Amino acid sequence: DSSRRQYQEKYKQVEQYMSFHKLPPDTRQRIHDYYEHRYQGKMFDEESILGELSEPLREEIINFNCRKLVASMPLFANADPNFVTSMLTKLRFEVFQPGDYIIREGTIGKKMYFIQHGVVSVLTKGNKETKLADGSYFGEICLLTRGRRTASVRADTYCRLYSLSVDNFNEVLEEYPMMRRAFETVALDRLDRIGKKN
Amino acid sequence: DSSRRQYQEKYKQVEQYMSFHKLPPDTRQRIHDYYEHRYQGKMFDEESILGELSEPLREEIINFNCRKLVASMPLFANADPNFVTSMLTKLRFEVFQPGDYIIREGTIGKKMYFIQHGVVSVLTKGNKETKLADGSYFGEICLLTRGRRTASVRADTYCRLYSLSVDNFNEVLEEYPMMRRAFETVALDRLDRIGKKN
Amino acid sequence: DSSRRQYQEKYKQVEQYMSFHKLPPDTRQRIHDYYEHRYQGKMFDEESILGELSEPLREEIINFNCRKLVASMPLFANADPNFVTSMLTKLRFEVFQPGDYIIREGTIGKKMYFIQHGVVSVLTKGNKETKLADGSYFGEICLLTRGRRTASVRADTYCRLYSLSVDNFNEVLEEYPMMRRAFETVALDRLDRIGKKN
Amino acid sequence: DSSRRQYQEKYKQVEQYMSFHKLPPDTRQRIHDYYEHRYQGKMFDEESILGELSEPLREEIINFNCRKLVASMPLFANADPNFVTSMLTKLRFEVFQPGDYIIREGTIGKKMYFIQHGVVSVLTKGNKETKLADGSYFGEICLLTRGRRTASVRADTYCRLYSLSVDNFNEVLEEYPMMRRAFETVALDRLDRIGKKN
Ligand SMILES: Nc1ncnc2c1ncn2[C@@H]1O[C@@H]2COP(=O)(O)O[C@H]2[C@H]1O
Ligand SMILES: Nc1ncnc2c1ncn2[C@@H]1O[C@@H]2COP(=O)(O)O[C@H]2[C@H]1O
Ligand SMILES: Nc1ncnc2c1ncn2[C@@H]1O[C@@H]2COP(=O)(O)O[C@H]2[C@H]1O
Ligand SMILES: Nc1ncnc2c1ncn2[C@@H]1O[C@@H]2COP(=O)(O)O[C@H]2[C@H]1O
């Protein structure tokens, strides 16, 4: 109940932020609904709490939190738990509201994404390529080629995603060189379909 | 009303800071008036609040906050919204009181500035060169030559400025190489008028 | 008594974290018992408190806190107090619960550990090699070879350990080049027993 | 009066820190007296307060706080105010209690010190070389040679010092190359007296 109060006080603080900056009506609605979807009536200082815990405890916890995502994904469910735990500890939780652009085509990608829950459209030049949903990942291509985004990725629904930076991706694959190929197969496949060796 | 209280408590904390360090009369006045002009009776932990929001929400917000500045400036109003949003997300809000030196001639510039509101004198050797106001930028020269300031820039009034570091400037122009020329035209023009290829 | 309250409030915050993420029964028990063993009914913002103190005061304090560990260890008890204080100021306190994996074989080691109190099994390929306890260190090998872990190290009991990063290890040994050999003797000895020049 | 309360609450927090870690009698006394000498019954979040202020306001403030030190020192009192303000903004306040070792001979120096108030003994091999007091600086030698401390420096009294890191020292002297010589004259002089070109 102090974490429900936390959320309430922090929301009243947001309300005032929005009044002061005279934020427009679509963005106040969006912010209101973002708070409810992500935090759900409670707030915690996750990284403070987790900060006070031991390494193995942070890793039981994150292994539990991403339990279903792990199982969704042959890359994880079939891998050495030490590697999954390595990658998992580097993921950042992000929520996106419907219609949001996650990745914009032709930008410099420094980030990759795994879908816990949601549907995503992959788009090039305003044209639908496929959709991706729970147990898919995207944005891997730029982590490997180290160049420009080959497609746009828009949230079609609310989306619970975990992001993984380019530096964190390489640190893990240095430690687990055998895992690199699996990403490469997927990114070659996708590069075939959209017709690129740029 | 908790953000008005925040400002009040933080101001009483400032008052005590000033008594303890026996701060002189011109600087207590200045500080008093700085608080009122920048914060306006309210305080928020902007970056905490924004921190809790999604990327796209931070970008609606900053696009809204710099809405008029964008429109003031052909560099922005005529550009690809993705680039404007890129640059915008890297800007830092600074306020300067009349008579303040923003840039001192012959220093190493690591920073550039866009004027939301205010008037600025550009000066060399104690001599007025021009004034700049709402919808101008300055300090771009050192971001490009990577050397010494070619003029002083003083605030003639209260000034709402957004600063952009040299590293952030280059990160964006790497992503948007086509935007570099527009800065270069302006900085060549200005280098002509004050007679430098140093 | 405000530090006992601190612990209590932060524990109620943890309880709620655990309910919200529907944490499983073995991990709630573990977390409960971790809090009691590490913090003992009190919490302090150590690094805030220490932050307000002078350097020499931080160093009396840490020299006192690791007083018995120093005396346990010929590397410290026989060394120049300036070097011990150098190393000591770089140590991080970690607690591990029984059965926890401190180091996993074949990972990239960036960290070394000194035992204040506890027993540890050193393991290769699921086979017991030795145990280490109060006044031992481990993980030094990867700090010197800059490669892969040559054994697993599991906590057999509760364990009060101090960790020392690879960068911090080298910064100190640059300042105290004469101390390098002592680690090298130990790591050569251990590399002999498990049969590696990898 | 909320800053006097701040100090009181933070001191009760310290008291508990000391009881819990069963800190010894000389170090509790020292800590008690350190708090009283440095903070004087009040505490402020200086860098939070200063953080909310503009650059020019931070620089009036620090120019005022180090007003007498500036005037004490030909290096400052005779220099371009822009350079003094550059250096000043990079200084960190440190207090040392009598008998404290500020610099230990033969360590790697990354830091230099200016005396606001106090007396210091400079020592080599346990032998007094000179004393330094208000308006002196020391530790400059290692900032220039980038090697080992040529003497020990002990606080003989309470000492209000401002420290300046090696990186900050070079950043300023890059911007103000003309100021380098003045340090060099002093460090050559001192290297003569203690007989070093090491
Ligand atoms: N044909 C496709 N099918 C599924 N996903 C794709 C396809 N084309 C591109 N992507 C994803 O869209 C992402 C856009 O960012 P990247 O180019 O870094 O990596 C891309 C892939 O992860
Ligand atoms: N003649 C001018 N007209 C307008 N602005 C100028 C002129 N000369 C210099 N400036 C600006 O003053 C700034 C001082 O810092 P910079 O040299 O980095 O870049 C300079 C320009 O942005
Ligand atoms: N035979 C052994 N006896 C004691 N400790 C060992 C032995 N073999 C390995 N270790 C320790 O186990 C550690 C595993 O990590 P490192 O390879 O970095 O360094 C290793 C040593 O510190
Ligand atoms: N003879 C001396 N007189 C005054 N100060 C000295 C003398 N010798 C050394 N020092 C100072 O003592 C400092 C010890 O650290 P450094 O060698 O970096 O720089 C040294 C000088 O700042």
PDB file of N, CA and C in Angstrom, chain C residues 2 52, chain D residues 1-16 35 39-44:
ATOM      1  N   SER C   2      16.360   5.156  13.826  1.00  0.00           N
ATOM      2  CA  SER C   2      15.868   5.552  12.486  1.00  0.00           C
ATOM      3  C   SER C   2      16.449   4.664  11.358  1.00  0.00           C
ATOM      4  N   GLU C  52      30.462  12.078   3.023  1.00  0.00           N
ATOM      5  CA  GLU C  52      30.504  13.336   3.740  1.00  0.00           C
ATOM      6  C   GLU C  52      31.737  13.431   4.560  1.00  0.00           C
TER       7      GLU C  52
ATOM      8  N   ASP D   1      16.912  27.129   9.393  1.00  0.00           N
ATOM      9  CA  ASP D   1      16.623  26.098  10.458  1.00  0.00           C
ATOM     10  C   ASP D   1      16.297  24.665   9.984  1.00  0.00           C
ATOM     11  N   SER D   2      15.934  24.485   8.709  1.00  0.00           N
ATOM     12  CA  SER D   2      15.797  23.117   8.154  1.00  0.00           C
ATOM     13  C   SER D   2      17.161  22.506   7.751  1.00  0.00           C
ATOM     14  N   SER D   3      18.126  23.376   7.469  1.00  0.00           N
ATOM     15  CA  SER D   3      19.509  22.979   7.258  1.00  0.00           C
ATOM     16  C   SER D   3      20.256  22.641   8.570  1.00  0.00           C
ATOM     17  N   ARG D   4      19.861  23.249   9.698  1.00  0.00           N
ATOM     18  CA  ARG D   4      20.363  22.813  11.031  1.00  0.00           C
ATOM     19  C   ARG D   4      19.767  21.458  11.432  1.00  0.00           C
ATOM     20  N   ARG D   5      18.526  21.199  11.013  1.00  0.00           N
ATOM     21  CA  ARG D   5      17.834  19.941  11.285  1.00  0.00           C
ATOM     22  C   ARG D   5      18.453  18.849  10.429  1.00  0.00           C
ATOM     23  N   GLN D   6      18.634  19.145   9.148  1.00  0.00           N
ATOM     24  CA  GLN D   6      19.373  18.288   8.232  1.00  0.00           C
ATOM     25  C   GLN D   6      20.681  17.748   8.827  1.00  0.00           C
ATOM     26  N   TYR D   7      21.526  18.648   9.340  1.00  0.00           N
ATOM     27  CA  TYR D   7      22.785  18.296   9.989  1.00  0.00           C
ATOM     28  C   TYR D   7      22.575  17.382  11.199  1.00  0.00           C
ATOM     29  N   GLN D   8      21.562  17.691  12.005  1.00  0.00           N
ATOM     30  CA  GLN D   8      21.237  16.916  13.196  1.00  0.00           C
ATOM     31  C   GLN D   8      20.784  15.493  12.867  1.00  0.00           C
ATOM     32  N   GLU D   9      19.873  15.358  11.909  1.00  0.00           N
ATOM     33  CA  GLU D   9      19.375  14.057  11.489  1.00  0.00           C
ATOM     34  C   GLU D   9      20.468  13.222  10.849  1.00  0.00           C
ATOM     35  N   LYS D  10      21.310  13.876  10.054  1.00  0.00           N
ATOM     36  CA  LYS D  10      22.398  13.193   9.403  1.00  0.00           C
ATOM     37  C   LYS D  10      23.480  12.814  10.419  1.00  0.00           C
ATOM     38  N   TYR D  11      23.648  13.616  11.464  1.00  0.00           N
ATOM     39  CA  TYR D  11      24.541  13.220  12.532  1.00  0.00           C
ATOM     40  C   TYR D  11      24.026  12.009  13.371  1.00  0.00           C
ATOM     41  N   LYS D  12      22.722  11.967  13.672  1.00  0.00           N
ATOM     42  CA  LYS D  12      22.115  10.803  14.346  1.00  0.00           C
ATOM     43  C   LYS D  12      22.253   9.548  13.495  1.00  0.00           C
ATOM     44  N   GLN D  13      22.215   9.725  12.173  1.00  0.00           N
ATOM     45  CA  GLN D  13      22.422   8.631  11.236  1.00  0.00           C
ATOM     46  C   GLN D  13      23.869   8.133  11.297  1.00  0.00           C
ATOM     47  N   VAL D  14      24.805   9.069  11.460  1.00  0.00           N
ATOM     48  CA  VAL D  14      26.229   8.775  11.616  1.00  0.00           C
ATOM     49  C   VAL D  14      26.485   8.043  12.924  1.00  0.00           C
ATOM     50  N   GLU D  15      25.909   8.551  14.010  1.00  0.00           N
ATOM     51  CA  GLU D  15      26.020   7.917  15.315  1.00  0.00           C
ATOM     52  C   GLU D  15      25.681   6.449  15.226  1.00  0.00           C
ATOM     53  N   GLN D  16      24.540   6.138  14.603  1.00  0.00           N
ATOM     54  CA  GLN D  16      24.121   4.741  14.383  1.00  0.00           C
ATOM     55  C   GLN D  16      25.070   3.958  13.476  1.00  0.00           C
ATOM     56  N   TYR D  35      32.676  16.539  11.598  1.00  0.00           N
ATOM     57  CA  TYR D  35      31.353  17.092  11.328  1.00  0.00           C
ATOM     58  C   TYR D  35      31.189  18.513  11.805  1.00  0.00           C
ATOM     59  N   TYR D  39      30.922  21.229   8.637  1.00  0.00           N
ATOM     60  CA  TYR D  39      29.554  21.571   8.349  1.00  0.00           C
ATOM     61  C   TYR D  39      29.010  22.663   9.263  1.00  0.00           C
ATOM     62  N   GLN D  40      29.513  22.693  10.492  1.00  0.00           N
ATOM     63  CA  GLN D  40      29.249  23.776  11.430  1.00  0.00           C
ATOM     64  C   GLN D  40      27.807  23.879  11.906  1.00  0.00           C
ATOM     65  N   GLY D  41      27.068  22.786  11.895  1.00  0.00           N
ATOM     66  CA  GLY D  41      25.741  22.804  12.476  1.00  0.00           C
ATOM     67  C   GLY D  41      24.696  22.867  11.393  1.00  0.00           C
ATOM     68  N   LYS D  42      25.152  22.959  10.152  1.00  0.00           N
ATOM     69  CA  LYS D  42      24.232  23.025   9.039  1.00  0.00           C
ATOM     70  C   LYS D  42      24.678  22.120   7.902  1.00  0.00           C
ATOM     71  N   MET D  43      23.708  21.591   7.168  1.00  0.00           N
ATOM     72  CA  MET D  43      24.001  20.838   5.965  1.00  0.00           C
ATOM     73  C   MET D  43      23.124  21.313   4.836  1.00  0.00           C
ATOM     74  N   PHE D  44      23.702  21.324   3.640  1.00  0.00           N
ATOM     75  CA  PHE D  44      22.990  21.709   2.428  1.00  0.00           C
ATOM     76  C   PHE D  44      23.355  20.692   1.362  1.00  0.00           C
TER      77      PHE D  44
END
